Amino acid sequence: DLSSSPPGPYGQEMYAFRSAARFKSPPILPPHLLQVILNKDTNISCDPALLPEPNHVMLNHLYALSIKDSVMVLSATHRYKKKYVTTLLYKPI
Amino acid sequence: NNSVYTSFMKSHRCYDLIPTSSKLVVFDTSLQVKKAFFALVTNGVRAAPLWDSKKQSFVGMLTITDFINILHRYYKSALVQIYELEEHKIETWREVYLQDSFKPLVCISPNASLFDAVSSLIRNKIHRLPVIDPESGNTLYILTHKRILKFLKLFITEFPKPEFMSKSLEELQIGTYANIAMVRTTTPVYVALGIFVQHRVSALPVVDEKGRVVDIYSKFDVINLAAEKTYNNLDVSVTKALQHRSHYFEGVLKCYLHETLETIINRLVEAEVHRLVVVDENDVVKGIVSLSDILQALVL
Amino acid sequence: GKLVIWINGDKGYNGLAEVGKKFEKDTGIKVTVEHPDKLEEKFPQVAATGDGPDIIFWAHDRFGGYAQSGLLAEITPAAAFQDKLYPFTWDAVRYNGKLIAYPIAVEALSLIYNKDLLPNPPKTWEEIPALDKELKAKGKSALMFNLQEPYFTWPLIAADGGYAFKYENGKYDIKDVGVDNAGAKAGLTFLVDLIKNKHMNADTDYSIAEAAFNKGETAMTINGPWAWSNIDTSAVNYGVTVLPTFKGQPSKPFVGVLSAGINAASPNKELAKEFLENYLLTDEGLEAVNKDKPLGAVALKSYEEELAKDPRIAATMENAQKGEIMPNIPQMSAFWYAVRTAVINAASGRQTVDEALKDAQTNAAEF
Amino acid sequence: EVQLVESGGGLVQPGGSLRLSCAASGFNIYYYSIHWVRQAPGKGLEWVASIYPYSGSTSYADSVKGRFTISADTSKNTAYLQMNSLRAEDTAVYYCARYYPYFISYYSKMEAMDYWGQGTLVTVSSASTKGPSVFPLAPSSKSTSGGTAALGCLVKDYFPEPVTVSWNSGALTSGVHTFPAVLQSSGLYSLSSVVTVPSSSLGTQTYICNVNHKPSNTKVDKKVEPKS
Amino acid sequence: QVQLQESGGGLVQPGGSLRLSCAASGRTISRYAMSWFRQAPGKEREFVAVARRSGDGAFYADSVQGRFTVSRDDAKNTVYLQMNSLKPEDTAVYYCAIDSDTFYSGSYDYWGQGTQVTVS
Amino acid sequence: VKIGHYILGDTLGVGTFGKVKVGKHELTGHKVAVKILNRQKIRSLDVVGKIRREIQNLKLFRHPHIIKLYQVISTPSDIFMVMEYVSGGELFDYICKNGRLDEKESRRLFQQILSGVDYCHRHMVVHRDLKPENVLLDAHMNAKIADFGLSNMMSDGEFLRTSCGSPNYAAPEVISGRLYAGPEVDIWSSGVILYALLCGTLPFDDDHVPTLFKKICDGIFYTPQYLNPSVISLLKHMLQVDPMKRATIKDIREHEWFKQDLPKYLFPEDPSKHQGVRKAKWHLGIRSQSRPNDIMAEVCRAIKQLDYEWKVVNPYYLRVRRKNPVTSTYSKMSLQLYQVDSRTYLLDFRSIDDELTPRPGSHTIEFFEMCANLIKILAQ
Amino acid sequence: QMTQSPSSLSASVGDRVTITCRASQSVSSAVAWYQQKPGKAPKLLIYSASSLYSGVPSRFSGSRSGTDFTLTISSLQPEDFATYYCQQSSSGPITFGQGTKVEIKRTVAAPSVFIFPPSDSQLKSGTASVVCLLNNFYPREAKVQWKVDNALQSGNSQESVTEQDSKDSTYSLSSTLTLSKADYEKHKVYACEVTHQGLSSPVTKSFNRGE
Ligand SMILES: Nc1ncnc2c1ncn2[C@@H]1O[C@H](COP(=O)(O)OP(=O)(O)OP(=O)(O)O)[C@@H](O)[C@H]1O
Ligand SMILES: c1cc(-c2cnn3cc(-c4ccc(OCCN5CCCCC5)cc4)cnc23)ccn1
Ligand SMILES: Nc1ncnc2c1ncn2[C@@H]1O[C@H](COP(=O)(O)OP(=O)(O)O)[C@@H](O)[C@H]1O
Ligand SMILES: Nc1ncnc2c1ncn2[C@@H]1O[C@H](COP(=O)(O)O)[C@@H](O)[C@H]1O
Ligand SMILES: OC[C@H]1O[C@H](O[C@H]2[C@H](O)[C@@H](O)[C@@H](O)O[C@@H]2CO)[C@H](O)[C@@H](O)[C@@H]1O
């Protein structure tokens, strides 16, 4: 990644080891995600294609669903210059 | 004449046509066709731009018309289970259905004008074409004629409104009047599917033995048969197929030939429908005006 | 080595038991009278196996399909015995020129009304909802009859031009069926509209309509002469008149001739023939059945000469003369349950008039 | 031509393993499930075992669960009921029967036992083979007027079951009453056999009971005598 | 305490018909059986007929097998004896009895009361 | 001639107690085969509860080589049953058309017929009147058994009708006078079918009918040199006149000729606004209740197999990048681990936009293609 | 896992009998009926409680009323006198009925009571058993009791009733009361008292010791 400024500029498949001296826990997710792990809002009064306005932090993250059959539900609420899209993608397992 | 709407559609881009938020489905081409229309039931949207992972491009479009074609072709009997809808996939079915007609996916940049979008909807005989941003490559929204008239009617407020809007519907020759497709209320679902496949029509207003319209049967009503898992029983009458919404609707949005066009548009965009039937005092069918002919009159 | 009689449960079986006792008193051979349910269906399946009843009592419409399977014996009547009965009663039991049954009586539908609730009987089918609009405010009903069986619903259908099979010269045309014409569509449309406009109940059968008429709950009923004993038991002031006209045309009921069929597998043919010809079709034998439940216009002219004084039986004969005799072809056996299924599907609202009559037209002769 | 010949029966010691067979002749054992039943003397039938070779599934009653290992050999068309750890209560005649599980008609799933064997008699007793001990029953001198005098012989404490009794008056017998054997608490058997005779023949006619016991070779006679 | 009462019987003509009745109360009657006895003058007590719990068996004696008919009732708690083809020599006192055997078809017989049926 | 939405036409064939006619759907033109059973001809009990038992029992026997039954329509005169139609005709007509068949096709038909008889024997029903006139071919050259238990009405009433009605196809036990005809008649009829598929003629054929009964009772038949001796041992073990030595399904399944070309699916068991909208509960990432130092190694082991190019910034911040095979541009994303609690850890994905290059294909759909290959390998 | 319970009865030749079979749990129409002659094999009569097994004629008939299976024998021939068995077969384990026996109807005869004294041959052996005899009684049900020395002793009596006669249809009961030689010092009189269905007064026979 040219845009990235990493400590290590390698970008290699081999150099990823869990033998680091740090035993630090990963940080906590912000509370705005505490809604989207449990609840997603769909406007029943408007068109089903239309959705209520999502938050600015929940944009590019995946949204999976339990596999009732051989499909694989995954989506993300991407952002255009001004408009918001929500790309549901359905793929067989 | 049409110089006030043509310059309007050439000045205003399709970028303003996209709503603030929009749920959008895409389907993998190696997915089975049985669960795709059940997913269209669950999400509620009527269209899905197909993606081919083996080619890395938007390969096509799967819609209610494709549902009509598959339940007209690979449907043998009501007693026989429909094994073909289970076993076929989108990649398997499109190579059979697109054998004679090779039609690639048409689209438009969102930075382009609405005039080119209307001229690509009408010429290709397509109701729903998506938009694809050429800088990124992603799909944003699925345009519809209804969304275009909702974008127009909010902006028709200027002084020169009645160029030809004050004229009657019969003198303007708006709408198809010669070859009308009709079904009786006792006709089964499968003959309506056969008329939907033989013609390129989008709705069938049902009539009685006299010819009076009592209900309307559209392609949107067909997907509720897949919703309630009655897609295997296509031999029931259209009245039992229209009893799904009998506790909800009011009637049939009928208009007359001596009515001005702007009142028809104001009743059309307010009631969120796609077409109206023309009738008389005896309530017989004389034709159907649709959005693909109203925008055909406007685009000239 | 005995005689077993099967007759329908709404008939006079005790009079047949009395005639069997009068037979056992004179020769010693006992007669057992049974009334099985759906005996027109139970009879040929046991008659093909060589057992069952020796003699069957039913109308002539099933006897042709019984005769094509070889289940009925050829009868040999004398010329005086043919002279004692009406000639059209002999014509009704002809199958390919051969005689297959002894005629008993002629049954025809008539309009039966309550004189206390309705002193003037209607002459028009269309004014029956107009009468029912008045009668529902009084807690009564205009007309209730068996809608589950097509025999009672047939006159209102066939009044405007409906017919079972085309009869031109001694043969019924199996491909010319008039249940899909405009008259049958108008009749079944009116029959459905009686139910839709809450003038009649679709679940009404023979038992419920009989209990309604004996308790005085309805003003009119459509039934045969066999219910006259149950009408006399309930002491209702009753009248019997001509069925009303429909769109200027009279009703066309099936004319039913009750007949006596003899099983071909029975060794007791001679005893049965002597029993019938010496006891049943006499002046003393018919009145024993008539005292239990009235059969209607009998085929014996000597008893009919005294019987014709009853104006009820005179109106029954008038409806028979303005009616139509049933065909005796085996295609009637496919016709009956097809028209029954059409009437049940039209009355319950499961199918329309056009779909039910198209199913009746396609399943008319064959199925 | 179906006959179910049982074998391997007889008499066993308690705590001993027995294996009785059932030679299925006239049909094939792989399709039909051979079922064994228990018929106690005086009691009714009681189902004990089952093996169904077509699906390879067995069945067992609740009282004999996990103790009577049933086996079926499709090569010789026999059914092996290997019994293990038998109790004293399990003393009966064991019939062999085929079982028809198929639809003979459209509406009736036939589930009965068509063809039955003759059944072999297994006897479980801790006591060994012991010869009988006949003792005469004395007719009482006092009697009612015009009343017959009952005379019989008592056969007590014998094993095994079949004892045939005979008298010395004639080969043909009249007024005979041969009772079934009763199993007393000591494991052995008892037997009575009375003959009704007129009371006037006590001083003139004499009777001698003949006790015949074939598996013990005991042929003892006992002259019954009217004595106070 | 148990009670017992007979009824019927008297100076009747021989060869005709006569009915007898017997009843008890205060205790369960469906699970117990009833019986009839005869005691001729100059003779010992003799047996006539018995009736089981729910109609399982109708038993008689050698002389009264084809002449007498015994019955019982569950609602009025009575029994009936239909005597047909009576004889002039069968004049005796007729007894009713109570079987005290519980849950078994055996009998322990005791007679409460007897009436005097004297034919002419 | 009108049942459901099916008109009737000509007569396909005749049966022992059934008239087979062709039905045609008036809208689709699909061919159905109706089977008429006259109640006048054979009817044990006419109670409608038995018809209910037929509707419950007969429909549920679904097998890819048994003709499936669709519905049993009742009628005062007859009984109609709508079986499926096959355009290849009877097996006996195919034998009379083509004569002797190849061994590789005769075994392919014989395995399907035996797997159709074994399904019936597992579901406790026999087909006593089995013959090459009661097994059909489809368009795809398979084998279909016509009537599984419908022949039983012939057997139930009297065994003499079975011998008189079908003298050729009748077991030695049945003509000898056995009461109940079990699965040994099925094995004998399948042996006669196998001899018809291997030689074309019938093994027990005579003009005089008691001599034909004697020929069925005799355990000898003709054997040409056209067929290999590996199958004549199976024929001698299958066509025994005594049912003690007659073969079973297991005794064919352990034979050498039967196991040569056997498809696995023959035997089920190896051992003997207007529209409604249902709300969905979406999640955020991947919820793994393990140690955080092991989840990163599991992610690395997952993405190492897919040939990706990645670097890290934090010990739990991984900016991965893959080059598309057909598309010249490359796609980038970023994985990050989150601690929602001390038990479970969440793996969250984030995309980054292409700044300057007008890349073809799609951006977000290739972003979902960078994740749909990862969820399958992680399986969490 | 369940149980069965038939009735028990006795009737005459040509009589119409019926035998119920109350199933414990809810079963289907999978109940058979087995006729077993004494000392023979149980012959099958009706396999699914409603339809006749081929062989034995139409005299045997069965009806199904929920979980109360019936067996009706119209026109009882003089060959159909045997023991009938209900048989449940729908579940996993198979449970037979208790088994009903059908006896021919007979006129009631008073039992003939004859007491048997022990002989002196078995007195020296130590094991002497006293027995009382019932002759030509009817029906099978009788109750014997040993009120020995005016004391009802139970537990040592063992009854053994035989089958009915071929020409007389009469029963015969034998109850063996076993004792020892040392038990006769607590013994003066022995009494076998019997209470029959047709015996009006219970009669017992007592013989004094040492005569
Ligand atoms: N002219 C009309 N009169 C009465 N009802 C109508 C008419 N046109 C459409 N409808 C009803 O509106 C419902 C949906 O409308 P339609 O079938 O035209 O799809 P649509 O809503 O236009 O789809 P989209 O919103 O995606 O363009 C149908 O169920 C139909 O019954
Ligand atoms: C028994 C059989 C059937 C049945 C189902 N399909 N079917 C088909 C037939 C049939 C009868 C005659 C046929 O004609 C033979 C000619 N065909 C077509 C030309 C090439 C050779 C084969 C073809 C098929 C007969 N019966 C049935 C249904 C119910 N019971
Ligand atoms: N954007 C597109 N580009 C190319 N073909 C399309 C496009 N959209 C739809 N189609 C084709 O047109 C058919 C559906 O058209 P139409 O009937 O207008 O859809 P709907 O039923 O949603 O109105 C589909 O079979 C599809 O192959
Ligand atoms: N049911 C119908 N019968 C005849 N023409 C129709 C029907 N529905 C739509 N059309 C015509 O089809 C054209 C396209 O409209 P649409 O099908 O709505 O895209 C217009 O000319 C309509 O008038
Ligand atoms: O349509 C039903 C039934 O009607 C006739 O049978 C009648 C008949 O009119 C009466 O004589 C009497 O028997 O009542 C019957 C039924 O209620 C037809 O004769 C019969 O074929 C038809 O099924």
XYZ file of N, CA, C and O and ligand atoms in Angstrom, chain B residues 46-47 59-66 68-69 93-94 97-98 103-107 124-130 200-202 219, ligand 3:
155
model
N -37.382 -5.435 -6.576
C -37.787 -6.212 -7.739
C -36.663 -6.457 -8.738
O -36.898 -7.112 -9.757
N -35.459 -5.952 -8.485
C -34.370 -6.089 -9.443
C -33.070 -6.381 -8.710
O -32.905 -6.046 -7.535
N -22.733 -9.003 -15.234
C -23.052 -9.845 -16.382
C -24.502 -9.679 -16.854
O -24.786 -9.861 -18.043
N -25.420 -9.285 -15.980
C -26.807 -9.198 -16.394
C -27.725 -8.753 -15.280
O -27.288 -8.218 -14.261
N -29.017 -8.989 -15.498
C -30.077 -8.528 -14.613
C -31.089 -9.647 -14.419
O -31.535 -10.256 -15.395
N -31.441 -9.920 -13.164
C -32.429 -10.932 -12.806
C -33.622 -10.239 -12.159
O -33.468 -9.568 -11.132
N -34.805 -10.397 -12.755
C -35.986 -9.648 -12.329
C -37.224 -10.539 -12.356
O -37.161 -11.760 -12.567
N -38.366 -9.875 -12.154
C -39.675 -10.513 -12.160
C -39.996 -11.073 -13.539
O -40.663 -12.104 -13.654
N -39.515 -10.419 -14.603
C -39.701 -10.948 -15.953
C -38.962 -12.271 -16.132
O -39.481 -13.204 -16.756
N -37.763 -12.381 -15.552
C -37.056 -13.657 -15.546
C -37.779 -14.700 -14.705
O -37.745 -15.891 -15.041
N -41.057 -14.826 -14.518
C -42.139 -15.215 -15.424
C -41.633 -16.196 -16.474
O -42.287 -17.204 -16.770
N -40.451 -15.924 -17.039
C -39.897 -16.801 -18.068
C -39.539 -18.173 -17.512
O -39.789 -19.192 -18.169
N -29.101 -21.163 -16.069
C -30.346 -20.758 -16.712
C -30.143 -19.662 -17.753
O -30.866 -19.634 -18.756
N -29.181 -18.756 -17.544
C -29.001 -17.668 -18.502
C -28.342 -18.136 -19.791
O -28.563 -17.532 -20.845
N -31.478 -19.392 -21.587
C -32.454 -18.366 -21.942
C -31.891 -17.330 -22.909
O -32.632 -16.816 -23.754
N -30.598 -17.015 -22.815
C -29.955 -16.050 -23.698
C -29.215 -16.730 -24.844
O -28.163 -16.248 -25.279
N -27.767 -10.057 -25.160
C -27.996 -8.679 -24.731
C -27.154 -8.372 -23.502
O -27.480 -8.849 -22.398
N -26.075 -7.603 -23.630
C -25.253 -7.277 -22.461
C -25.936 -6.246 -21.574
O -26.961 -5.657 -21.921
N -25.339 -6.034 -20.403
C -25.903 -5.120 -19.418
C -25.700 -3.677 -19.867
O -24.565 -3.232 -20.065
N -26.801 -2.949 -20.026
C -26.759 -1.528 -20.346
C -26.886 -0.747 -19.041
O -27.540 -1.183 -18.085
N -26.201 0.392 -18.977
C -26.187 1.231 -17.787
C -25.898 2.663 -18.220
O -25.868 2.975 -19.414
N -34.136 0.403 -25.383
C -33.788 -0.976 -25.069
C -34.967 -1.791 -24.554
O -34.795 -2.994 -24.323
N -36.141 -1.163 -24.396
C -37.358 -1.770 -23.836
C -37.093 -2.370 -22.455
O -37.461 -3.508 -22.155
N -36.442 -1.577 -21.610
C -36.040 -1.986 -20.270
C -36.685 -1.031 -19.276
O -36.627 0.190 -19.457
N -37.322 -1.587 -18.244
C -37.898 -0.754 -17.195
C -36.837 -0.272 -16.215
O -36.864 0.888 -15.790
N -35.916 -1.150 -15.829
C -34.966 -0.880 -14.754
C -33.540 -1.083 -15.253
O -33.119 -2.221 -15.490
N -32.794 0.012 -15.401
C -31.359 -0.092 -15.609
C -30.616 0.596 -14.470
O -31.026 1.674 -14.027
N -29.539 0.004 -13.970
C -28.794 0.601 -12.860
C -27.845 1.683 -13.363
O -27.729 1.941 -14.560
N -44.888 -8.403 -24.706
C -43.934 -7.722 -23.840
C -44.647 -6.803 -22.855
O -44.095 -5.789 -22.420
N -45.880 -7.155 -22.496
C -46.727 -6.330 -21.646
C -46.303 -6.495 -20.194
O -45.538 -7.407 -19.858
N -46.794 -5.615 -19.322
C -46.412 -5.636 -17.919
C -47.582 -5.817 -16.963
O -47.352 -5.963 -15.756
N -47.497 -7.897 -12.820
C -46.350 -8.770 -12.599
C -45.847 -8.695 -11.162
O -45.248 -9.657 -10.669
N -29.791 -2.888 -17.325
C -30.063 -3.940 -18.135
N -29.229 -4.282 -19.140
C -29.488 -5.323 -19.953
N -30.574 -6.105 -19.844
C -31.492 -5.875 -18.880
C -31.285 -4.755 -17.951
N -32.332 -4.756 -17.108
C -33.143 -5.784 -17.468
N -32.639 -6.450 -18.522
C -33.261 -7.624 -19.172
O -34.651 -7.354 -19.335
C -35.449 -8.361 -18.719
C -36.414 -7.696 -17.751
O -36.908 -6.477 -18.297
P -38.226 -5.812 -17.657
O -39.400 -6.705 -17.973
O -38.276 -4.360 -18.063
O -37.926 -5.912 -16.078
P -39.111 -5.769 -15.000
O -39.856 -7.079 -15.087
O -38.388 -5.554 -13.692
O -39.900 -4.576 -15.482
C -34.525 -9.322 -17.990
O -34.691 -10.646 -18.501
C -33.117 -8.833 -18.262
O -32.362 -9.856 -18.916
